[PDB]
Design a protein around this motif. Structure first.
Motif, PDB file in Angstrom:
ATOM      1  N   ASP A 204       0.799  -1.204   0.000  1.00 11.56           N
ATOM      2  CA  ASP A 204       0.000   0.000   0.000  1.00 11.56           C
ATOM      3  C   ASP A 204       0.839   1.263   0.000  1.00 11.56           C
ATOM      4  N   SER A 205       0.222   2.343  -0.478  1.00 11.55           N
ATOM      5  CA  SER A 205       0.864   3.648  -0.613  1.00 11.55           C
ATOM      6  C   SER A 205      -0.156   4.756  -0.856  1.00 11.55           C
ATOM      7  N   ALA A 206       0.138   5.964  -0.382  1.00 11.46           N
ATOM      8  CA  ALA A 206      -0.729   7.116  -0.637  1.00 11.46           C
ATOM      9  C   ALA A 206      -0.987   7.228  -2.125  1.00 11.46           C
ATOM     10  N   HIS A 207      -0.024   6.789  -2.920  1.00 14.21           N
ATOM     11  CA  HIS A 207      -0.098   6.957  -4.351  1.00 14.21           C
ATOM     12  C   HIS A 207       0.507   5.752  -5.040  1.00 14.21           C
ATOM     13  N   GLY A 208      -0.342   4.751  -5.281  1.00 18.42           N
ATOM     14  CA  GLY A 208       0.093   3.490  -5.857  1.00 18.42           C
ATOM     15  C   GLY A 208       0.683   3.612  -7.256  1.00 18.42           C
TER      16      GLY A 208
ATOM     17  N   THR B 134      -7.764  13.497   5.017  1.00 25.13           N
ATOM     18  CA  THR B 134      -7.804  14.918   4.645  1.00 25.13           C
ATOM     19  C   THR B 134      -6.999  15.251   3.383  1.00 25.13           C
ATOM     20  N   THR B 135      -6.493  14.210   2.708  1.00 23.18           N
ATOM     21  CA  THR B 135      -5.789  14.329   1.430  1.00 23.18           C
ATOM     22  C   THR B 135      -6.456  15.308   0.454  1.00 23.18           C
ATOM     23  N   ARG B 136      -7.765  15.164   0.285  1.00 29.96           N
ATOM     24  CA  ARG B 136      -8.493  15.982  -0.677  1.00 29.96           C
ATOM     25  C   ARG B 136      -8.546  17.433  -0.229  1.00 29.96           C
TER      26      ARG B 136
ATOM     27  N   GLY C 143      -6.102   8.173  11.441  1.00 29.76           N
ATOM     28  CA  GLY C 143      -5.414   7.888  10.196  1.00 29.76           C
ATOM     29  C   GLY C 143      -3.993   7.401  10.383  1.00 29.76           C
ATOM     30  N   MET C 144      -3.490   6.648   9.416  1.00 29.25           N
ATOM     31  CA  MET C 144      -2.111   6.190   9.477  1.00 29.25           C
ATOM     32  C   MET C 144      -1.184   7.293   9.007  1.00 29.25           C
ATOM     33  N   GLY C 145      -1.755   8.291   8.347  1.00 23.75           N
ATOM     34  CA  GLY C 145      -0.982   9.440   7.933  1.00 23.75           C
ATOM     35  C   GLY C 145      -1.188  10.576   8.910  1.00 23.75           C
ATOM     36  N   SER C 146      -1.690  10.240  10.099  1.00 22.42           N
ATOM     37  CA  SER C 146      -1.884  11.230  11.157  1.00 22.42           C
ATOM     38  C   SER C 146      -0.606  11.374  11.965  1.00 22.42           C
TER      39      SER C 146
ATOM     40  N   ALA D 289       0.310   8.838  14.378  1.00 18.51           N
ATOM     41  CA  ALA D 289       0.590   7.580  13.702  1.00 18.51           C
ATOM     42  C   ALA D 289       2.013   7.582  13.158  1.00 18.51           C
ATOM     43  N   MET D 290       2.420   8.713  12.610  1.00 17.96           N
ATOM     44  CA  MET D 290       3.731   8.817  11.987  1.00 17.96           C
ATOM     45  C   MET D 290       4.850   8.864  13.024  1.00 17.96           C
ATOM     46  N   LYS D 291       4.511   9.297  14.235  1.00 19.19           N
ATOM     47  CA  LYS D 291       5.491   9.353  15.312  1.00 19.19           C
ATOM     48  C   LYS D 291       5.891   7.962  15.780  1.00 19.19           C
TER      49      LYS D 291
ATOM     50  N   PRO E 290       0.550  16.232   7.671  1.00 16.81           N
ATOM     51  CA  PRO E 290      -0.371  15.106   7.868  1.00 16.81           C
ATOM     52  C   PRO E 290      -1.530  15.093   6.885  1.00 16.81           C
ATOM     53  N   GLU E 291      -1.981  13.904   6.500  1.00 22.80           N
ATOM     54  CA  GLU E 291      -3.140  13.781   5.630  1.00 22.80           C
ATOM     55  C   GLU E 291      -4.223  12.913   6.277  1.00 22.80           C
ATOM     56  N   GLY E 292      -4.113  12.743   7.587  1.00 24.88           N
ATOM     57  CA  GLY E 292      -5.098  12.005   8.359  1.00 24.88           C
ATOM     58  C   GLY E 292      -5.250  12.715   9.692  1.00 24.88           C
TER      59      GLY E 292
ATOM     60  N   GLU F 221       6.938  10.013 -10.759  1.00 22.69           N
ATOM     61  CA  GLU F 221       8.300   9.597 -10.460  1.00 22.69           C
ATOM     62  C   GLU F 221       8.943  10.614  -9.544  1.00 22.69           C
ATOM     63  N   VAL F 222       8.129  11.457  -8.923  1.00 23.79           N
ATOM     64  CA  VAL F 222       8.667  12.523  -8.090  1.00 23.79           C
ATOM     65  C   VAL F 222       7.991  12.569  -6.723  1.00 23.79           C
ATOM     66  N   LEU F 223       8.832  12.698  -5.702  1.00 21.88           N
ATOM     67  CA  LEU F 223       8.369  12.783  -4.336  1.00 21.88           C
ATOM     68  C   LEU F 223       8.239  14.241  -3.980  1.00 21.88           C
ATOM     69  N   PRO F 224       7.243  14.569  -3.156  1.00 20.07           N
ATOM     70  CA  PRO F 224       7.019  15.924  -2.652  1.00 20.07           C
ATOM     71  C   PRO F 224       8.331  16.574  -2.276  1.00 20.07           C
ATOM     72  N   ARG F 225       9.296  15.821  -1.781  1.00 22.44           N
ATOM     73  CA  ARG F 225      10.591  16.378  -1.418  1.00 22.44           C
ATOM     74  C   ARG F 225      11.277  16.985  -2.613  1.00 22.44           C
TER      75      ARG F 225
ATOM     76  N   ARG G  28       3.434  20.669  -2.340  1.00 23.49           N
ATOM     77  CA  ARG G  28       4.371  19.605  -2.685  1.00 23.49           C
ATOM     78  C   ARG G  28       3.664  18.257  -2.756  1.00 23.49           C
ATOM     79  N   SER G  29       2.885  17.945  -1.728  1.00 23.59           N
ATOM     80  CA  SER G  29       2.099  16.716  -1.694  1.00 23.59           C
ATOM     81  C   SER G  29       1.239  16.586  -2.955  1.00 23.59           C
ATOM     82  N   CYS G  30       0.537  17.668  -3.295  1.00 21.47           N
ATOM     83  CA  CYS G  30      -0.260  17.741  -4.524  1.00 21.47           C
ATOM     84  C   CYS G  30       0.533  17.436  -5.769  1.00 21.47           C
ATOM     85  N   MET G  31       1.567  18.243  -5.983  1.00 17.88           N
ATOM     86  CA  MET G  31       2.437  18.125  -7.153  1.00 17.88           C
ATOM     87  C   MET G  31       3.073  16.762  -7.199  1.00 17.88           C
ATOM     88  N   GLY G  32       3.294  16.177  -6.029  1.00 15.62           N
ATOM     89  CA  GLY G  32       3.758  14.806  -5.939  1.00 15.62           C
ATOM     90  C   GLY G  32       2.697  13.888  -6.523  1.00 15.62           C
ATOM     91  N   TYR G  33       1.461  14.031  -6.067  1.00 15.26           N
ATOM     92  CA  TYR G  33       0.408  13.208  -6.641  1.00 15.26           C
ATOM     93  C   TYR G  33       0.208  13.387  -8.136  1.00 15.26           C
ATOM     94  N   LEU G  34       0.544  14.561  -8.668  1.00 13.56           N
ATOM     95  CA  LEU G  34       0.350  14.810 -10.100  1.00 13.56           C
ATOM     96  C   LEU G  34       1.629  14.584 -10.916  1.00 13.56           C
TER      97      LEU G  34
END
Ligand SMILES: COc1cc(NC(=O)Cn2ncc3c(=O)oc4ccccc4c32)ccc1Cl
Ligand SMILES: COc1cc(NC(=O)Cn2ncc3c(=O)oc4ccccc4c32)ccc1Cl
Ligand SMILES: COc1cc(NC(=O)Cn2ncc3c(=O)oc4ccccc4c32)ccc1Cl
Ligand SMILES: COc1cc(NC(=O)Cn2ncc3c(=O)oc4ccccc4c32)ccc1Cl
Ligand SMILES: O=c1[nH]cnc2c1ncn2[C@@H]1O[C@H](COP(=O)(O)O)[C@@H](O)[C@H]1O
Ligand SMILES: O=c1[nH]cnc2c1ncn2[C@@H]1O[C@H](COP(=O)(O)O)[C@@H](O)[C@H]1O
Ligand SMILES: O=c1[nH]cnc2c1ncn2[C@@H]1O[C@H](COP(=O)(O)O)[C@@H](O)[C@H]1O
Ligand SMILES: O=c1[nH]cnc2c1ncn2[C@@H]1O[C@H](COP(=O)(O)O)[C@@H](O)[C@H]1O
Lengths: 345, 345, 342, 346
Positions: free
Chosen positions: A122-126, A179-181, A260-263, A266-268, A274-276, B24-28, B299-305
């Motif tokens: 799994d991934s935020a962006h498969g 909260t990604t959207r 969320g796992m992206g909260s 959760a990340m700590k 964060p996106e959760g 192929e790009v990470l928000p970073r 960055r997160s956005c542009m990462g997704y796109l």
């Protein structure tokens, strides 16, 4: 006043209603069996989310005994994850899953030899290079089915299948705790997303998992009607005893935690984006009762659609779009509930 | 029954979602440099609004250090506006902007002499005879880039470019404190606004500044994705310490005052007809934290796109329309939020 | 749906698009026509409602370049006295309302020197309304405003039978329940647009009646073809309004009711308006100023120095609910009142 | 094109539309409200009280038939208590009355008919099913009585029921106040579209459509009929009334009496079962006659605005517009605080 980048209107579960069909099947007669992946089967199309506040061994065992399956989360060390999967499958030889992240190849091999039946990559962006490459190496070093996500496009679905995906998991932004959207402005309404990915995945006979967004059993039906082979659900189960979670009482009612796992918390386990979010849910007590009403709802749905199997549901289903005022019609209106019901919290 | 004066459906940020692309790009790894005007560039696409309760030397230096820019407002005498420009500019030779109103020709002259990098020629109605004149009047006597606004039509933007505009600010009505669409009944939903103006401006290589309406970091991604070179923010920065105005407390929490420039107090500096109101916003402490997560959202956005620069974001972006029930999906639903998140409050 | 004839739009549904402009709001001309023979300086009319317009209100509008319609919920001479008081005061223009078949009432009003008569009805497109319209026109030299209607066909037919003005609006009023009790109505923008398509061909003014909540709605109404707007609730809370002031919180209210409500009809009657309550807003004059201010602002953004030019140059976009929240004040909490936006 | 191939279009409900006024020569008081209940049975007014154990028993049925409508006694009881219940109605002046039965309840039906019921309502959550069609065939073969069958929301369901002897078709899946079918099963069709579709088939055969559920206000009556229904069935409105069964309870300083779905846990008991209705309460609205008077007042008013002197003229001359959420705001009361409560508009 319309722009070139608008590729259409996207629809969520609350946007549609399923249209009744001629029927000669009772809800009690309906077959609910389904393919989780290409090689793994299930008897109910339900999957508990790979979240630290939803699924550990106790949730998986519960899921597996009811015909579904649970995905132990990866927010722990590698072979404490292995112990979780050893618990479930020493326990009646039940069928169980586990989640891993990008490039977590070692973790996966361990889980496999621990007897895990499916790996969820799994991934935020498969639909990403790191994912594609992580998938190829797994399939070359391991003989095991891999579900991959999350994705929402034709293009993702196709390319992930072309590299070995045994299952494709759909959903960006629909989760109760997502909260990604809002943070990244990115996503696709869950019905349209499942539709787009079905039209490709079904060509190859690869199961689609509709992840996130499920609020009522009627949503399970909509998701399947539109092309899913199963649904992954988090917040519904996070209210149950079997979810890991710390109970709390704030007023007269008891709650337990769902995040969320992206909260951040959760990340700590900061300067983080964060996106959760971290939240609570009404404690709904026992699992088996929650799942039963969900299954009850789906059987009722398939009976209205004269569909005796998921596969027949795909052939016979259609839906109409509704408006906000249609949705108001659809809920309870103008009368005031005197007793709480489990169907309709 | 439809009418001939209806020219289409205008969309704002909550009406759309950006669709994920192969990445192929990470928000970073994403580049965020952009063009403010055709001769001035920023390393992040963020501008603080020219408001007496938003931008002064302190906000401006803070913006500049972060790689953006601040526009010192014009709700002060000429010499003190110049003083403000000197403060920012003596502090690390940092880029800075200044707003002037129509016909305010010597103000502009002084500002430029003070080493300002850009002048923002502002009016509720950019596409009027007086602004055009003032614009042509500055370019003849002064060497400086000029931003002009606000407009929302493509003929408005073509005509401003033809007369020397170095950038165009888009936005009529979308502001948090704006009542123009209610008092006057005029405006265009910000996305459609940015789209129409981009389709002209981009052929000339003139930057669009999307001004007003930003509620979340995902809004920024949407604005840029459909054509903006940068965004102008008021209310999100209004509640930062570096904001002018003073804190006041009503309850548990402390709020910091944010008002329109078209509000009565703002024009006071009462036979007036205002198009702005006077309000309050949560004090959110230091701006660096505020801005830090705006940038992260983008960055997160542009990462997704899959877009490593705004350039590629422009080439690769697409979106779907959503209903209000799709928006209910996109937000947190059905879970009570336990602890604060600056992304989402 | 076979019977579905399209989507109808209200004021909240649209935004007006800005045009190249070289006219300041202060320079804009607001002159217009009430009827084809009666013109005004500002395009405002106060409603013929017993909680809105009597002599003190009617003389109020005419004062500011507008006009007020005295309501018919009183006997004939008392209505006549009301029109006399306004006429005897400065000679200002005034109007008055009559119902179907009330021809006698009508010329009493005419003999009193009423400028315009408003023949009104829940349903103007009816045989009885066309009857009364025709006797009046044969026995009296007077401009007649007829309503209420919402279709092209109703507009055409009323004009063919002598109408000097046409009032548009079935169901939009703040106190109206017609669309709920009967399920009937047409959203106000679409209704004005339909009726203007016919009425402007004949050079007959349209009065956009009801539903006006902010000054932005006036501009919208005119922009799509009306020559003026009728206003109840905005004015019901003013001083020069009839009715009475009750205090209940620490803020002041005064009553405002529909003419189709139980109190306004006095009980096996079927109510089609309700009995209500509106914030007191002090002296009328300031309210009107802010309304005209809003419209002058509107026409400035559209580069329109007159209504005729506003008709020629105006376009709108449709917005979603989400666009509407963008449009209002959002995510900021308001410190204290503004006249425009309350 | 984010358009799905399973999307067959947008469904509409009462609050989505508004009826457009027509030229009129007729007044609300002059309009005829007669209609056909079934192919052979007709009413003075288009109203039918619901077959629910919290709405219709003899006192409600008698009250309805009085006013020119009809009540359907609910089936949530033994067989000849339902029979006695229709006896009570019939001995009260030979008034018209109906009774509900379920799938394969041929015996109950026979006993109802022998007691002089004017109509049998063959109900099911899914009218378009094998066992409903069979039950219809068996009833029609062994008995002479009009049978209404529901519920449905499609053309082909409408056609298939008429082809097998249905004398009336009842439309509505998920619309009702106490209904959760669309949330639990995710199934249904917005009521306006549902009536339309089913009208487009039934009208040809001269079979009345009963519009069932969703009626919140009198203007919803006019909309259901204008779009093709011959009558509407009503629960929640009448549940609050005096002649409603269910006994009053006070919780606030306001009296309520209970109102539940027939698919509610309590009704079905009459824990391991799955609810498609809930258990709720409604404001007690006093005597029935006023409530029904207001609904009729409203309809007459509708038909006057549409210049239609009867339901068939209404079917011919009606048209509507779609409105948005903002249109609905315009339509309701707005910007005014209501000082006196109105039976029209709760
Ligand atoms: C995979 O690379 C990307 C990551 C992100 N963002 C994140 O991964 C944020 N995040 N960071 C950690 C997590 C997570 O554990 O679970 C998530 C579930 C859904 C959505 C996000 C997360 C998440 C955005 C765009 C791209 Cl291209
Ligand atoms: C450019 O002339 C016009 C001005 C207005 N109205 C105003 O500018 C009122 N106003 N008066 C002073 C201000 C102001 O400082 O900031 C504003 C920001 C947005 C909108 C309005 C204002 C504002 C309307 C139409 C036109 Cl054509
Ligand atoms: C007699 O004509 C009709 C009357 C009505 N209803 C009424 O006139 C009730 N009514 N009775 C008195 C009034 C009234 O003063 O103002 C109204 C404004 C709008 C709607 C109704 C009224 C009103 C409905 C349809 C028709 Cl065709
Ligand atoms: C066998 O027919 C079906 C029945 C159901 N569900 C039910 O019958 C549930 N139920 N079980 C008992 C009842 C009832 O009395 O009234 C209802 C009214 C509306 C909706 C449901 C009920 C109801 C769902 C699908 C089908 Cl195909
Ligand atoms: O932190 C998060 N941000 C966004 N999405 C998440 C996050 N954590 C889990 N998800 C997704 O949300 C799903 C659960 O959705 P739910 O059933 O609606 O609560 C999971 O299976 C994940 O796909
Ligand atoms: O009083 C006013 N009325 C309308 N718009 C205003 C007013 N004052 C500032 N604005 C605009 O609103 C923007 C900020 O809006 P925000 O980011 O949504 O709070 C500013 O940059 C201006 O473009
Ligand atoms: O009782 C009634 N029912 C429905 N509409 C009414 C009633 N009384 C007055 N109206 C209309 O509503 C208009 C005023 O509405 P308002 O300006 O929005 O408050 C009047 O000018 C009449 O056209
Ligand atoms: O439990 C139930 N679930 C779903 N629909 C029901 C249930 N009980 C009654 N109904 C339907 O709802 C209608 C009444 O709805 P109402 O008139 O909107 O309150 C009845 O005539 C039945 O068709």
């Amino acid at each position: 006043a319309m722009g070139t980048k608008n590729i259409g209107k996207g629809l969520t579960f609350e946007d549609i209603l399923l249209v009744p069909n001629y029927s000669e099947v009772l809800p009690r007669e309906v077959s609910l069996e389904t393919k989780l992946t290409k090689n793994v089967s299930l008897k109910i199309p339900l999957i508990s989310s790979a979240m630290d506040t939803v699924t550990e061994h106790l949730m998986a065992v519960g899921m597996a005994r009811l015909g579904g399956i649970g995905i132990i989360h990866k927010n722990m060390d590698m072979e404490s994850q292995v112990n979780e999967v050893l618990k479930v499958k020493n326990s009646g030889g039940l069928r169980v899953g586990a989640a891993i992240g990008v490039n977590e190849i070692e973790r996966a091999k361990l889980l496999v030899e621990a007897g895990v039946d499916v790996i969820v990559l799994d991934s935020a962006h498969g639909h990403s290079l790191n994912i594609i490459r992580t998938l190829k190496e797994i399939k070359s070093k391991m003989n095991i089915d891999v579900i991959v996500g999350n994705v929402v496009t034709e293009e993702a679905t196709k390319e992930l299948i072309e590299n070995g995906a045994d299952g494709i998991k759909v959903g960006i932004g629909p989760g109760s705790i997502c909260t990604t959207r809002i943070v990244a402005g990115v996503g696709v309404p869950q019905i349209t997303a499942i539709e787009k990915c079905s039209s490709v995945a079904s060509k190859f006979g690869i199961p689609i998992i509709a992840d996130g967004g499920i609020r009522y059993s009627g949503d399970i039906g909509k998701a399947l009607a539109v092309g899913a082979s199963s649904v992954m659900i988090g917040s519904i189960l996070a209210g149950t005893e079997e979810s890991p979670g710390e109970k709390e009482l704030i007023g007269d009612t008891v709650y337990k935690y769902y995040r969320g796992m992206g909260s951040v918390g959760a990340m700590k386990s900061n300067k983080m984006v964060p996106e959760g979010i971290e939240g609570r849910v009404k404690y709904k007590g026992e699992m088996e009762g929650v799942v039963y009403q969900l299954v009850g709802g789906l059987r009722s749905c398939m009976g209205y659609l004269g569909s005796a199997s998921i596969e027949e549901l795909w052939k016979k289903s259609s839906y109409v779009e509704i408006t906000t005022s249609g949705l108001r019609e659809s809920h309870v209106h103008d009368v005031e509930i005197v007793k709480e019901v489990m169907n309709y919290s």
